[PDB]
């Protein structure tokens, strides 16, 4: 795969090559791939190759990465949660995966 | 995703954000997501977003988390197994994934 | 599973037994297995056992392996990307998963 706007990768603490799970709100597909850096500021969320069987243009998707860490660290760990607008621009960054803005 | 009663998360040694596999007894669906803390004592098992394609209200589900650990530790490791009643209240906590109460 | 030409395993930094994800360009199948060393220089990409339900002879596939590593290392990590020709011979090796030759 998935090509992500560099701005979105930075906002979400995703590195080029980092494993990424994609889930599709529209059809319920779930798959695992890796991030590819997309043109900064373009808003690209591009699905390449095999994954285009499961994800289609215009779909609403969630992108997820996981970390493995010591138990002690996991108890204080804070995720990077990035809410985007209709143009895939980051409008809110926080700790709560269930937070919705406005 | 999955919103879990805080009482159930504590009983099962699940942290907010911890990866969780869900398997559905009724339809056989299997998916991977993360835990979101639900209102303590409410009995909430809530399926949010994309996963609602695969899991439906009233379904019986199993929630599973895994740990990675040194071989030496794994030989003495004891899981946290939480059996719940019809209202998602914890009625038994033990080491045996196959134990059933009464 | 998947039997891979030893030349391709070496080119891609895959060890015998290493976990491997296979995605199928033709039908969109996605599965996880491990690498088995194939006869060096034969061009074998062989799908054995259960995975032959999902992958068929003549399909175009992508083979992927992941590594787990410290955050500091991940920021400078460079993958091994192997582009092959119509006979599964390695024609290009680089760092960019999205690079296509000629």
């Amino acid at each position: 795969x998935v090509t992500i706007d560099a701005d979105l990768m930075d906002a979400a603490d995703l590195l080029e090559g980092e494993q990424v799970t994609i889930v599709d709100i529209d059809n319920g597909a779930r798959l695992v791939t890796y991030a590819i850096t997309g043109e900064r500021g373009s808003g690209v969320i591009g699905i390449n190759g095999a994954a285009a069987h499961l994800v289609h243009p215009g779909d609403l998707v969630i992108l997820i990465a996981y970390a493995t860490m010591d138990d002690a660290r996991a108890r204080t760990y804070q995720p990077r949660i990035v809410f985007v607008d209709a143009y895939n621009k980051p409008i809110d960054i926080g700790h709560d995966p269930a937070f919705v803005p406005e | 995703x999955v919103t879990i009663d805080a009482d159930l998360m504590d009983a099962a040694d699940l942290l907010e954000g911890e990866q969780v596999t869900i398997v559905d007894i009724d339809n056989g669906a299997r998916l991977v997501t993360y835990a979101i803390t639900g209102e303590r004592g409410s009995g909430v098992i809530g399926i949010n977003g994309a996963a609602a394609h695969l899991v439906h209200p009233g379904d019986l589900v199993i929630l599973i988390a895994y740990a990675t650990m040194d071989d030496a530790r794994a030989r003495t490791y004891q899981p946290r197994i939480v059996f719940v009643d019809a209202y998602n209240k914890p009625i038994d906590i033990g080491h045996d994934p196959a134990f059933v109460p009464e | 599973x998947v039997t891979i030409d030893a030349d391709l395993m070496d080119a891609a930094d895959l060890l015998e037994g290493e976990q491997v994800t296979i995605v199928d360009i033709d039908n969109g199948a996605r599965l996880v297995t491990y690498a088995i060393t194939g006869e060096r220089g034969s061009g074998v990409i062989g799908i054995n056992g259960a995975a032959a339900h999902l992958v068929h002879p003549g399909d175009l596939v992508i083979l992927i392996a992941y590594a787990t590593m410290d955050d500091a290392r991940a920021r400078t990590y460079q993958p091994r990307i192997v582009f092959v020709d119509a006979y599964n011979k390695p024609i290009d090796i680089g760092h960019d998963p999205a690079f296509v030759p000629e």
Binding site: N48, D59, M69, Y77 | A65 | -
Partner: peptide, 24 residues
């Protein structure tokens, strides 16, 4: 002992393109 924890989420993103022949 190691736990697997959510670390990044980008949510309700709109797929801008999706095609079998694009590589990245």
């Amino acid at each position: 002992m190691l736990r697997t924890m959510l670390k990044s989420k980008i949510h309700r993103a709109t797929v801008t393109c999706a095609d079998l022949h694009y590589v990245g």
